[PDB]
Enzyme design. Structure first.
Site, PDB file in Angstrom:
ATOM      1  CG  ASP A   1       8.984  -1.246   2.980  1.00 39.13           C
ATOM      2  OD1 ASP A   1       9.512  -0.118   2.887  1.00 39.13           O
ATOM      3  OD2 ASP A   1       8.279  -1.579   3.958  1.00 39.13           O
TER       4      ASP A   1
ATOM      5  NE  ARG B   1       8.634   7.928  -6.400  1.00 39.11           N
ATOM      6  CZ  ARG B   1       8.655   9.239  -6.182  1.00 39.11           C
ATOM      7  NH1 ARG B   1       9.805   9.862  -5.961  1.00 39.11           N
ATOM      8  NH2 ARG B   1       7.523   9.930  -6.185  1.00 39.11           N
TER       9      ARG B   1
ATOM     10  CB  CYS C   1     -12.898   1.801   1.681  1.00 36.90           C
ATOM     11  SG  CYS C   1     -12.569   3.586   1.792  1.00 36.90           S
TER      12      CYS C   1
ATOM     13  CG  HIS D   1     -13.714   7.983   5.153  1.00 34.73           C
ATOM     14  ND1 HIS D   1     -12.416   7.797   5.576  1.00 34.73           N
ATOM     15  CD2 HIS D   1     -13.961   7.004   4.251  1.00 34.73           C
ATOM     16  CE1 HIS D   1     -11.899   6.751   4.955  1.00 34.73           C
ATOM     17  NE2 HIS D   1     -12.816   6.251   4.146  1.00 34.73           N
TER      18      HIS D   1
ATOM     19  NE  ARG E   1      -9.389  14.449   0.515  1.00 32.09           N
ATOM     20  CZ  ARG E   1      -9.361  13.170   0.149  1.00 32.09           C
ATOM     21  NH1 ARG E   1      -8.202  12.540  -0.003  1.00 32.09           N
ATOM     22  NH2 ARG E   1     -10.495  12.511  -0.059  1.00 32.09           N
TER      23      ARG E   1
ATOM     24  NE  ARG F   1     -11.617  11.050   3.903  1.00 28.59           N
ATOM     25  CZ  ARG F   1     -10.472  10.859   3.251  1.00 28.59           C
ATOM     26  NH1 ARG F   1      -9.320  11.302   3.746  1.00 28.59           N
ATOM     27  NH2 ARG F   1     -10.474  10.184   2.107  1.00 28.59           N
TER      28      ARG F   1
ATOM     29  CG  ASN G   1     -11.578   3.240   6.759  1.00 27.02           C
ATOM     30  OD1 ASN G   1     -12.307   3.367   7.750  1.00 27.02           O
ATOM     31  ND2 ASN G   1     -10.347   3.739   6.706  1.00 27.02           N
TER      32      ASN G   1
HETATM   33  N1  LIG Z   1      -6.358   3.655   4.009  1.00 26.18           N
HETATM   34  C1  LIG Z   1      -7.515   3.233   3.554  1.00 26.18           C
HETATM   35  O1  LIG Z   1      -8.513   3.347   4.257  1.00 26.18           O
HETATM   36  C2  LIG Z   1      -7.622   2.843   2.062  1.00 26.18           C
HETATM   37  C3  LIG Z   1      -6.725   3.270   1.063  1.00 26.18           C
HETATM   38  N2  LIG Z   1      -6.915   2.864  -0.284  1.00 26.18           N
HETATM   39  C4  LIG Z   1      -6.012   3.244  -1.394  1.00 26.18           C
HETATM   40  O2  LIG Z   1      -4.787   2.524  -1.343  1.00 26.18           O
HETATM   41  C5  LIG Z   1      -3.708   3.350  -1.808  1.00 26.18           C
HETATM   42  C6  LIG Z   1      -2.666   3.593  -0.759  1.00 26.18           C
HETATM   43  O3  LIG Z   1      -3.350   4.092   0.382  1.00 26.18           O
HETATM   44  P1  LIG Z   1      -2.824   3.885   1.870  1.00 26.18           P
HETATM   45  O4  LIG Z   1      -2.399   2.492   2.164  1.00 26.18           O
HETATM   46  O5  LIG Z   1      -3.962   4.425   2.622  1.00 26.18           O
HETATM   47  O6  LIG Z   1      -1.506   4.776   1.972  1.00 26.18           O
HETATM   48  P2  LIG Z   1      -0.013   4.613   2.524  1.00 26.18           P
HETATM   49  O7  LIG Z   1       0.778   5.864   2.331  1.00 26.18           O
HETATM   50  O8  LIG Z   1      -0.202   4.047   3.886  1.00 26.18           O
HETATM   51  O9  LIG Z   1       0.531   3.526   1.471  1.00 26.18           O
HETATM   52  C7  LIG Z   1       1.001   3.970   0.194  1.00 26.18           C
HETATM   53  C8  LIG Z   1       2.428   3.513   0.055  1.00 26.18           C
HETATM   54  O10 LIG Z   1       2.865   3.592  -1.309  1.00 26.18           O
HETATM   55  C9  LIG Z   1       4.253   3.717  -1.122  1.00 26.18           C
HETATM   56  N3  LIG Z   1       4.868   4.171  -2.347  1.00 26.18           N
HETATM   57  C10 LIG Z   1       4.506   5.277  -3.017  1.00 26.18           C
HETATM   58  N4  LIG Z   1       5.068   5.273  -4.226  1.00 26.18           N
HETATM   59  C11 LIG Z   1       5.800   4.162  -4.221  1.00 26.18           C
HETATM   60  C12 LIG Z   1       6.575   3.727  -5.291  1.00 26.18           C
HETATM   61  N5  LIG Z   1       6.542   4.388  -6.450  1.00 26.18           N
HETATM   62  N6  LIG Z   1       7.281   2.584  -5.108  1.00 26.18           N
HETATM   63  C13 LIG Z   1       7.245   1.931  -3.944  1.00 26.18           C
HETATM   64  N7  LIG Z   1       6.478   2.330  -2.923  1.00 26.18           N
HETATM   65  C14 LIG Z   1       5.730   3.453  -3.046  1.00 26.18           C
HETATM   66  C15 LIG Z   1       4.360   4.812  -0.112  1.00 26.18           C
HETATM   67  O11 LIG Z   1       5.688   4.883   0.396  1.00 26.18           O
HETATM   68  P3  LIG Z   1       6.106   6.238   1.119  1.00 26.18           P
HETATM   69  O12 LIG Z   1       5.496   6.321   2.464  1.00 26.18           O
HETATM   70  O13 LIG Z   1       7.698   6.223   0.908  1.00 26.18           O
HETATM   71  O14 LIG Z   1       5.455   7.527   0.366  1.00 26.18           O
HETATM   72  C16 LIG Z   1       3.386   4.315   0.925  1.00 26.18           C
HETATM   73  O15 LIG Z   1       4.147   3.492   1.814  1.00 26.18           O
HETATM   74  C17 LIG Z   1      -4.375   4.595  -2.302  1.00 26.18           C
HETATM   75  O16 LIG Z   1      -4.691   4.267  -3.668  1.00 26.18           O
HETATM   76  C18 LIG Z   1      -5.632   4.712  -1.427  1.00 26.18           C
HETATM   77  O17 LIG Z   1      -6.698   5.552  -1.942  1.00 26.18           O
HETATM   78  C19 LIG Z   1      -7.997   2.055  -0.629  1.00 26.18           C
HETATM   79  C20 LIG Z   1      -8.832   1.596   0.391  1.00 26.18           C
HETATM   80  C21 LIG Z   1      -8.647   1.972   1.720  1.00 26.18           C
END
Ligand SMILES: NC(=O)C1=CN([C@@H]2O[C@H](COP(=O)(O)OP(=O)(O)OC[C@H]3O[C@@H](n4cnc5c(N)ncnc54)[C@H](OP(=O)(O)O)[C@@H]3O)[C@@H](O)[C@H]2O)C=CC1
Ligand SMILES: NC(=O)C1=CN([C@@H]2O[C@H](COP(=O)(O)OP(=O)(O)OC[C@H]3O[C@@H](n4cnc5c(N)ncnc54)[C@H](OP(=O)(O)O)[C@@H]3O)[C@@H](O)[C@H]2O)C=CC1
Ligand SMILES: NC(=O)C1=CN([C@@H]2O[C@H](COP(=O)(O)OP(=O)(O)OC[C@H]3O[C@@H](n4cnc5c(N)ncnc54)[C@H](OP(=O)(O)O)[C@@H]3O)[C@@H](O)[C@H]2O)C=CC1
Ligand SMILES: NC(=O)C1=CN([C@@H]2O[C@H](COP(=O)(O)OP(=O)(O)OC[C@H]3O[C@@H](n4cnc5c(N)ncnc54)[C@H](OP(=O)(O)O)[C@@H]3O)[C@@H](O)[C@H]2O)C=CC1
Lengths: 337, 337, 337, 337
Positions: free
Chosen positions: C35, C80, C153, C180, C198, C234, C316
């Protein structure tokens, strides 16, 4: 063993039923419900809820005259005119009035003409009707009262901590504002209403409206007569609200001392009524809290030694309903005829 | 020149007034309004609107029986029962029925009893009532018709382009789904309603519900009888909606050819009714558009040479009201008695 | 028993943790989390959630390098760049890639470089990466695969019932539209974004956007290649979505026969994956459901004997995460090295 | 004739441009914009706006290096590093800093290294940076200041009427709370943020957060040093906010007298800055008001002769931007080198 009837199966009526169902060793027995919407509707809306979520109990219709919850059968009737209800025939001891229409003696009295022995209004009573707030003045209730009021959600949030402040610092005067979630009294889209502000689209505006919680506190706490006032701001959230109070005290103090006074009471005379939270939380985090008021310690401030500002949260649907249950419990324990 | 009365000063009632006010050289003259809320309420809600913004015109109350707009005076009456309305006394030619409760011949006729000459319902009629959609079949109107209907908002969006598709490619069969903004028939918080889905909190859910637009299309376009069906999904936006239509055609085609067919009509026989947009916009951008339907060209698709999918936008409040004014102008130009 | 690492503690990352925590006798063991926000931030947002509610478990920070859940300890790292992660040092078996930025072989492989053994992407992979959907083609997995994908999803909702429809009636061609809930890729207020739609305020508009689920279905179901296409809309809800599919089949049928075909699968080969609901519910009622897809039986329609329309619900966030846990269990049960 | 550059084309940057465009006989000339999003994006988002509506001007791209508004061409560049901007080469006199990132001398100074002659920050300045509020202390500005601040939206709402109260009644001490609409600094869905409260879903909660408007007022009004404090509550509305102030005055008065004091100033020294509304309005009704503060007379209260409570509205995007324009106008009129 008290035979109870619920008149008006809305947000408070349904929250009341679910609150009661969760209690252990209750002195109350809910045997009938007056829902002008019918049996199918009463069963469906009790099972599915956009705020509380799906009821974890087996709920279904029973014939065309009742419903059942985990096996317990409850009769359902439908009539907009109280004088025609079968209260006398059924032997009803207490009526829970949650329609928002029969808030005065003239109206609530119709239940007495129909046979019920007593009535409890889930809102401020209009006129000379005894008003009580659990944790503040319930000891003044007596079996002789035929009609009573449990006050409003806002008064139940204020009264408790206002009492602690006055006894440990002495309140000279103050003012308050409450940022409240919208309710069914407002309009979905701009439409007719007595209050020209409540007539405007609710999920889209910040809506100012009057409040009586100011002088309602004086009823349960005599010392504060003519010492407080206030207003309300309705915002775009479905449930949970917050109160903001500013008062002038006679005893000079500091923010850290005020919080100490609150924690002490919450641990003693007000355990289960008042609480204190020391974390950085948000409105949604207070959903389904059984207490009627929670102080946000980190937000407490004192300016010039005597001007105190307090912020407290409250679940206006669920927290208030747990209090209606408690008051009904008192009616039972004080019953003599 | 034509005496018009507005029965029901709600969303449609007030939008109609403002749409008319902006027209140049109108053959209509609004002289009275029946608002069961009051002269000031009609005055306040006409000047301030959560969706249209503040009305740019000096609006004021003219006593206790009328109001004033840019100088002109308009009488205000209050009576839930049409039979007792001063229509015959005021010599009313046409009544705009927008209460949503008098949609059948019996109910609507009560305006004729009160002395009114003709009635125009701002919704689908029930029973034997002629229905018209401007740009589709308005040419079939006759001064002989005492009671007419302007259909629903969804039907006014669909009919125009469905007509083009049938003439150019020949529709065999199809299905539709409309993602619609919430309206006054829904509830702010979970509450009693005949439709158990529409009873749920509107600003919080996606709510499936029935629609009659599918079968209604066959009314104005006889060749489509029995060829379409569909549903509706109510979502958390206050105004502006979108239609999604899928049909199988007899003549093979492709996406750009379909778009071009729509543009030819928009530039000719359907100018002012249908439009085609080539930019990447969203719902808020279509607020206050005068047309009944706007094709989103970049979303059009064709699968397997004969299955066509089209997406179209429409302002359900303002767009529909402009069509009400148009149908009223036709009645005025067809008066031969 | 299997060392698992979570890369990216976002919506999916945190939902996955709670889904796993509730499983009985799990062959997985989460030991570390990456995290880039902090040990306390991961701690605070894991306990309090605006959609799932307060986590029912004692959550606390274990120093400045880990946290505690019901006693167990889990290390917390921040970096990262994956190549510099202590994977090889901790002996990580599988890495749950949920950042949404490392979806190709090069990016994902960096976890293998750091010393990780296998990677599972919680999203559609780019290029040459094996994709699996539980209940559709998971049987084709092999321990030899170093990098795999669990699709989107929407794809997990569609694939299950599309498979039933093709086997029973034979799909010729079709089109789809998904209404969605908004996600983190959208903007709170009008702001810069590659996709000009978007970029617009998410809680205020209906926003059309592209989707890859249509073509993605052909990946797990080869027989459907080139037979489907679709779009997405959306809308203003925070979670829970719905799919609307229209297809032409080779074998004539009717609505109730189609529903029965879905029930047979739900009761057999697709138990726990697909479900069929006969009640009149709304989106909020499907929150926290464990299945990937739920058919709304009363909305199913058939036009002209061979054009079928189906409506299906899906959570989702929580629904998809349960499938991530399922695919991870398969990897554990297939370990032969 | 002042050559102006806008750095950061967000909500304030775009509101600034539209505010300027509507002025008559302006002493400013906007010749360049730094939008790291590109020419197409800058053109699209300037034309379409979910809050302000569609810009009534012909807006389009011009080649791949600029855009045009009603024929006036404006250059567009894109670089996140200020030191590399062509300010010196273009001869820029003043830079409008609206990125929210270069709020300190160290950062804002980079524009000076690149060649610009002066910088104006659209937010509170960090450190020893001169701060001004039009209508309160702008007369203290001199051409010698190389970097200045226009304060925050909240301070511009408070300062004005606080000045009227102190001069006509004498403020001893007070406290304030502002119910503010959400902004881009908050999260759409629960996610990482320094402020654990601002990390929670914005369209779904009532979010408490700190504010500096308290001591910021002391900067523009010396008399109030160390006499005020306050907090903020972020709610689910897209624009327009309100302030609630409670102060103790040395001169005993009454609500009706306080409103009289406000109306007098609004008609004289503060015409165009302060206003007084005597109608029952709602938040949406104050959209696009050019003043920086509007008092809601009907809500004014006085308890115990000396405790005053005031409620005032303000369009945080548009009203503030009109002030940025005014300050820039002063820079022009005082220019000497
Ligand atoms: N939400 C949903 O309904 C669904 C989402 N997904 C997929 O899952 C993925 C994430 O989506 P989602 O959970 O919605 O988004 P979030 O932004 O909630 O989660 C993505 C996380 O990745 C973190 N992050 C980005 N780059 C890094 C890195 N290089 N190293 C460490 N941490 C990093 C981001 O941190 P920070 O906030 O600092 O940018 C963020 O906390 C996407 O591929 C999305 O399409 C798939 C199914 C369902
Ligand atoms: N919500 C809250 O926060 C609180 C509300 N209250 C008070 O409780 C009362 C009800 O409020 P609330 O539950 O919030 O609102 P609801 O509208 O949800 O409940 C009121 C119910 O009364 C029903 N009803 C009205 N008249 C009759 C009748 N004559 N016979 C049978 N049923 C009838 C209504 O049915 P229908 O659907 O036909 O309108 C509605 O279901 C009011 O007095 C309110 O001020 C008090 C504390 C808290
Ligand atoms: N909103 C939209 O998008 C569209 C709506 N329509 C149709 O128009 C009709 C009204 O809809 P809408 O404007 O949305 O709803 P509103 O509730 O906004 O307007 C209906 C009005 O009718 C008034 N009313 C009801 N009965 C009477 C009566 N008997 N005498 C006098 N006034 C009465 C109601 O008053 P009160 O509030 O006291 O109940 C209400 O003000 C419906 O038929 C609807 O389907 C058609 C196209 C579009
Ligand atoms: N909104 C309001 O009510 C008020 C805001 N302010 C202040 O104004 C500032 C901006 O706020 P606001 O307009 O509201 O927010 P926005 O995010 O809408 O505007 C900020 C813009 O800065 C852009 N940006 C960030 N860094 C750079 C960079 N280095 N180079 C080029 N462009 C960049 C961002 O682009 P990107 O999209 O890449 O993030 C974003 O477009 C803040 O200082 C804020 O506190 C002051 C008064 C009122």
């Amino acid at each position: 063993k008290l035979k109870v009837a619920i008149n008006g199966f809305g947000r408070i009526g349904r929250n009341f039923l679910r609150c009661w169902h969760g209690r252990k060793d209750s002195p109350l027995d809910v045997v009938v419900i007056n829902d002008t919407g019918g049996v199918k509707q009463a069963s469906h809306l009790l099972k599915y809820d956009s705020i509380l979520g799906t009821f974890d109990a087996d709920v279904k219709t029973a014939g065309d005259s009742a419903i059942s919850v985990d096996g317990k059968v409850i009769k359902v009737v439908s009539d907009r005119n109280p004088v025609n209800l079968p209260w006398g025939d059924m032997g009803i001891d207490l009526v829970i009035e949650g329609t928002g229409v029969f808030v005065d003696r003239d109206g609530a009295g119709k239940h007495l003409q129909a046979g019920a022995k007593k009535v409890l209004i889930t809102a401020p009573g209009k006129g000379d009707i005894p008003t009580y707030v659990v944790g503040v003045n319930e000891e003044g209730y007596t079996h002789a009262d035929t009609i009573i009021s449990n006050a409003s959600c806002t008064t139940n949030c204020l009264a408790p901590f206002v009492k602690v402040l006055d006894q440990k610092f002495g309140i000279i005067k103050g003012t308050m504002t409450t940022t409240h979630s919208y309710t069914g009294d407002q309009r979905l889209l701009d439409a007719a209403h007595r209050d020209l502000r409540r007539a405007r689209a609710a999920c889209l505006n910040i809506v100012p409206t009057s409040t009586g919680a100011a002088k309602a506190v004086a009823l349960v706490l005599p010392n504060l007569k003519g010492k407080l006032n206030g207003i309300a701001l309705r915002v775009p959230t479905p449930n949970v609200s917050v109160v903001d109070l500013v008062v002038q005290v006679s005893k000079k103090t500091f923010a850290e001392e005020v919080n100490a006074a609150f924690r002490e009471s919450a641990d003693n005379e007000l355990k289960g009524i008042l609480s204190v939270c020391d974390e950085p939380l948000v409105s949604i985090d207070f959903r389904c809290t059984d207490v009627s008021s929670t102080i946000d310690s980190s937000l407490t401030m004192v300016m010039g030694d005597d001007m105190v500002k307090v912020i407290a949260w409250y679940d206006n649907e669920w927290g208030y309903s747990q209090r209606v249950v408690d008051l009904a419990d008192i009616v039972a324990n004080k019953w003599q005829a």
